[PDB]
Amino acid sequence: SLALSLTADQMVSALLDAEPPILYSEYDPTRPFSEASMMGLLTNLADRELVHMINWAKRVPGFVDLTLHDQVHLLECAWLEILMIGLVWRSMEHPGKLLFAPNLLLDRNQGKCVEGMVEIFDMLLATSSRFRMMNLQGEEFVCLKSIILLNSGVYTKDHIHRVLDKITDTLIHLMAKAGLTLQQQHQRLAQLLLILSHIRHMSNKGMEHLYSMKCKNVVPLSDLLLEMLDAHR
Amino acid sequence: SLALSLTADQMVSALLDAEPPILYSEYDPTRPFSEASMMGLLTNLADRELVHMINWAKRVPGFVDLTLHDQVHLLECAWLEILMIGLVWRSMEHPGKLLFAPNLLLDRNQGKCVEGMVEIFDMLLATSSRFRMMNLQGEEFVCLKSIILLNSGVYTFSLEEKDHIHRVLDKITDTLIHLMAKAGLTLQQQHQRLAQLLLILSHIRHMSNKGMEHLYSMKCKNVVPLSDLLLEMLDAHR
Amino acid sequence: KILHRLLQD
Amino acid sequence: HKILHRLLQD
């Protein structure tokens, strides 16, 4: 596997260069405020984002080395986590706001349209605020997102764990360059990875709410999104 | 706070001494297992474990410093996580089996009694096998379990009570590294092992959520009597 | 709130 | 099969 020969800087540059673009939402409406309208915009945005994620995943060092079916499993398992940490990352420089798209900036009041959305919004905003106070860097973000991809579905494998250790080495290397002490390095590393437990929690809770939407047949989600959904049951 | 002034070794001994006992289950090997009896045994067991967990949480450094309302929140949030990591810890030296109790040793074949249970069981088994391969130490386990208690519900609360929790969490991280350094691990090995342990917590969270929604479903399916304490813990996740 | 009671004492 | 299958090898 080529991914293990990579240096820390080679790992960073590979992840940064593989970053998906920031997509736009459908322009105009009435500035949502209906259950079908908002969930429609989010579903449309997420569906287009998934296409870029799949190509982003293929560029994550070590992901190509896995079996196709193993690639499917990891993506099916982590896709909402990856979407959320991206949303949370974009929403960093916008306190109290969730930047789904540059033309779609939401607060918790706009989540009252959908039942259970305010709860998830508050958790997402809390994560973004956590990222902000930690002053999360982009180099750290792309490592966290790659970790989510490889880790979330590994227990549902020697190669993956080897790559996971590689990303850990990269994270430490990033913090060492930032002038962090040895104590500050393992502390920040722990702080970052503990947030992943919450991203998992938000994804699980957020997933369930996508189920009830599918059963209510309120929003026409794509067949791709439906297949990513069925895999979690 | 006293927790912030605790040394690494003082932290370990404190967590070790606060360890809850391994409770036995009501189990009759003679009696035939049904998809309501076996769930009843686990429910009866978990309910009694909850009482020890609550008193265990009191002895976790920094936990008593928190407001009573936040103590409730943290436990309501992580109770199944803590039960599961305990279960996984006990089941480490029993490959392909889950030690719910010293007299209750289950495998995947007997998890088929309940629907959806076999997926949870396989995830628990995998987590146990993961701990076994890592050769997880008791001193590391009690650190991880205490991390779950403090971390799992910290982002679902100008209280400023969150800062104290993060300060304690950092102290526990210092403790883990101190343990690995004493085990002869190199600096790279320390950070790697630390990362490996904390990533497992993400999976334990996943198992808890999946386990929680399966507890909430059979609550509506009156086949199993959930205890009054357990019902209130379930209501918290809504 | 049973959890609340047991936490007090 | 899956749409995800197609998109992973394109």
Ligand SMILES: COC(=O)CC1CCC(=C(c2ccc(O)cc2)c2ccc(O)cc2)CC1
């Ligand atoms: C009950 O309401 C909630 O849970 C809100 C929750 C918000 C986040 C989320 C989604 C989402 C929404 C609809 C879908 O079909 C697919 C993905 C999302 C969308 C874009 C993005 O970049 C990241 C995530 C899921 C929904």
Ligand SMILES: COC(=O)CC1CCC(=C(c2ccc(O)cc2)c2ccc(O)cc2)CC1
């Ligand atoms: C539906 O099938 C399942 O998901 C199985 C799952 C197994 C583990 C679990 C439980 C559990 C089971 C029933 C309850 O009412 C409370 C706790 C548990 C019990 C004790 C313990 O020390 C750790 C965990 C939850 C159930």
